[PDB]
Symmetry: C3
Subunit: 368 residues, 3 copies
């Protein structure tokens, strides 16, 4: 019973699912246990869709920070007078302001589209609703919420017309993810602007973690990260994003984040995490794809890859976060203690400590 | 019965009242429905007073954003070394910072003074107290909480003297709102600064809503709005103000605010409102003068004026809010949706959708 | 039963205590009484250690605003690639960011080190844990929370040696505050930056409150105060500091803060305090060394020193706070009400109210 571990097979609630894909909402971080209370305004959403599909137009009373784990997506946000459309590849991230109507195409022919969105609801901490403009066997259009008179007046048309064309009270679709012809992807994709090296510090276009060099990278791992200091959209959310690769049989060395609260999601592969909290308490879990683990701020932890692994991290409370390592040569806080203090904090000579800590000649990732 | 509707006769508690005026406090938004949790920091206050009256000096442990619905006022904020007096007219808005001693005159001879303020308590979320300096048959001066010995040392006088002059333990007024002579309004007014075109973006002086052009206006209504982007006091509170007129028998077309939570207050007239939440849920209400209605962020709604109508609205969480209309020609999000997506999202041809969405030819306000 | 008085003897919990000093954590501000709910993210920590001692390296999931009440300290913050020592004197303040490893030396040979820190926990509002790197008879190292296998791989070493050097499962020390030699204090002191007049507005270094002229000073009292206006560290936190000396038999005149919530801490001496809330409510307490008292924003209060007195104040919600006195010549709000409104608000003529407010020729501090 590890409250910071959310196994994908029992921590989600399906919101919409059919033959074309699925939208699952993670359980609230706080309802499991009160140690995660300052995550109460955040939810994780998972979106997955079959090739040649579109998620129909809708908005939500929540900001979404979306990140493409794998596949390809056309994300099109439709404003009251304009339309922004973006071509997303793995590693691409983009903020969707609360209450923006958008739709989401998977234009690939064989690859499934895998998206995670950090949701930030506006009206009530941690709970929001999807408002679907469309009419569909799964859900009613929100335009159906207005009376016959009000609708007739607003559309300057008889109710029969507006019901036949918009609502369908057979003629309507089956779900909120539906299939596309080739011709329509051919037209829906061809206005979509793609992320670039020149977008890493843009205020509107999508940006990509992996388009820049890792902060740490050796023969055993790669750690990509983008922080509020570099991106104004992450600056506004006070969030950082990381995407880290670990070879099978290697680990990310024990470390902790000074002030950021980390939500990590397994994208591919499996891994063993150990987490330390306060006499000390060991928190352990064995993870697989779609699993979620949360590292409270300043709690040390380690990630031991048991297969080839990638995970995404969301860093809440991100501003001026420091990643402090407890082993290895680079970024090792323990080795920065004055020698006389090392002497008194541990049982052992200064030189006996100094020698023990110099042994691991590598940094960040090592072989296991 | 609609948790977002707050009928004026059932939703206000009277804080003070007598023959000269009255002050009432709206109920906590998050008590009425735990659906309005992110409004818990805010309260609505309604102030009304007769001609040639004054609300005596006091302060509160809340920020106020006050707005003059109708009538005329002199607002005087007293500082520890200074004093600022303002000449206020219908549409005039001003922030009173938390803990600022002030008093408030109705200088008019025949017109009642009607004011609404948005309260933002400091010590407890959504709860604050008024601290009256005056000693009055309806509340004790907060000077009276100090003991006799501390009073005498503080003021360097016998308690008899300070009691006689400050407290009167008859010689004191009957309530906190009391009548004024003509001579005194004469004296109290001749240093009051008035709002003006150049005050539209001050941090000091009152700014008037309806002194710029309306952002939408046609033959059926007018929509005045000032946002954080134009006025620095509104930027600090992160609030927008609107004032909107609607001719009897017209309506504000269905629309939603992308991210702003709106508290609206009926200033004059009668209206029916329809609000759509989530299968859809219809929330409907018939409103009149002094009633309040709350629209959560990204919930669509309509407002149908059954008599000539003016309402005031406060937008919580206002920065970069977008107003998205669902019908009419201008700022219509539905009509920004790509055509092939309209075909897949509604049960009807692409031309069938385009043809209906053009039928309504007006924007914003239409005749019912 | 004053819900704003936090008597030392029954409002603290001992976190650590041994022969060389002790750390204590004040009870939650809100668990006391629902009146202080907007202080639920804050906690007070009292620190005290004997001469020639050191607090062993640790970090916490909280920001600390620490303040030296009396004595001398070397504060060393160790970063992942750097180290920063500071030489602290009474009045010195420094923010220790969350998750910053640090150790705290008392280099004095006779005087104790009295420190208070304002904690702002990161993961759960108002609740944090200390993460000691050291393996001591009083607490396990958090490195012990990782498994045998993991620790071997990370430190490239057999578990016997890791255990034999860092953990020691007799060789280790008794508590988290331990004694120091004179060789060691020599060495830990010779790079220790010391606050001065060019750090008053640093974003990094200690700044001394008492190195500037006080804001109020006369023959009875001294009132030093530094605010977020002039120091970026306090600006990020939205906190002011004050330290005020009052001679025995003198008193701080009745006053309120407009918008700041004040946590005061008796450093040295005894005082009677009258607090006034809302008919009016009298709140009284006899304070002495280490007591804590909260003054909600906009509540008038008075400090009557019954022995030579110094206290420290944290002003939460500090930006643009105004201090309004209610007696004396300078910064007296009551003396700024127009004559005619003084005529209406008190049962005494304007001439009688004029004479009585003028009678206290002194300001801020006066003699009892």
């Amino acid at each position: 019973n590890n409250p910071f571990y959310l196994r994908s097979s029992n921590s989600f609630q399906t919101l919409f699912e059919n033959q074309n894909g699925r939208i699952r909402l993670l359980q609230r971080f706080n309802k499991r246990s009160p140690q995660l209370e300052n995550l109460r305004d955040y939810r994780i959403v998972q979106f997955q869709s079959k090739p040649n599909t579109i998620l129909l137009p809708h908005h939500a009373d929540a900001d979404f920070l979306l990140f493409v784990l794998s596949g390809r997506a056309i994300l099109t946000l439709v404003n009251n007078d304009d339309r922004d459309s973006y071509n997303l590849h793995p590693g691409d991230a983009q903020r969707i302001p609360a209450g923006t109507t958008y739709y989401l195409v998977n234009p690939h022919d064989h690859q499934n589209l895998k998206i995670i969105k950090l949701a930030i609801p506006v009206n009530k901490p941690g709970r929001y609703d999807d408002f679907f403009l469309s009419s569909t066997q799964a859900q009613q259009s929100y335009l159906q919420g207005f009376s016959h008179n009000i609708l007739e007046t607003s559309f300057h048309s008889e109710f029969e017309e507006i019901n036949r064309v918009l609502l369908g009270e057979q003629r309507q679709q089956e779900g909120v993810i539906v299939e596309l012809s080739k011709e329509q992807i051919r037209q829906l994709s061809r206005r979509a602007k793609s992320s670039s090296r020149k977008t890493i510090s843009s205020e509107d276009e999508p940006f990509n973690l992996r388009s820049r060099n890792p902060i740490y990278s050796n023969n055993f791992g790669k750690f990509f990260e983008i922080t509020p200091e570099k991106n104004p959209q992450l600056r506004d959310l006070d969030i950082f994003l990381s995407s880290v690769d670990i070879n099978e049989g290697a680990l990310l060395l024990p470390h902790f984040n000074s002030k950021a609260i980390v939500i990590l999601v397994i994208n591919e592969g499996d891994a063993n995490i150990e987490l330390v909290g306060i006499e000390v308490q060991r928190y352990r879990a064995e993870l697989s794809e779609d699993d979620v683990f949360v590292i409270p701020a300043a709690y040390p932890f380690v990630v031991n890859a048991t297969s080839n692994l990638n995970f995404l991290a969301f860093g809440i409370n991100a501003e001026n976060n420091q990643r402090n390592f407890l082993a290895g040569e680079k970024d090792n806080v323990v080795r920065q203690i004055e020698r006389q203090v090392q002497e008194l904090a541990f049982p052992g000579s200064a030189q006996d400590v100094e020698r023990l800590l110099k042994k691991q000649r590598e940094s960040y990732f090592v072989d296991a």
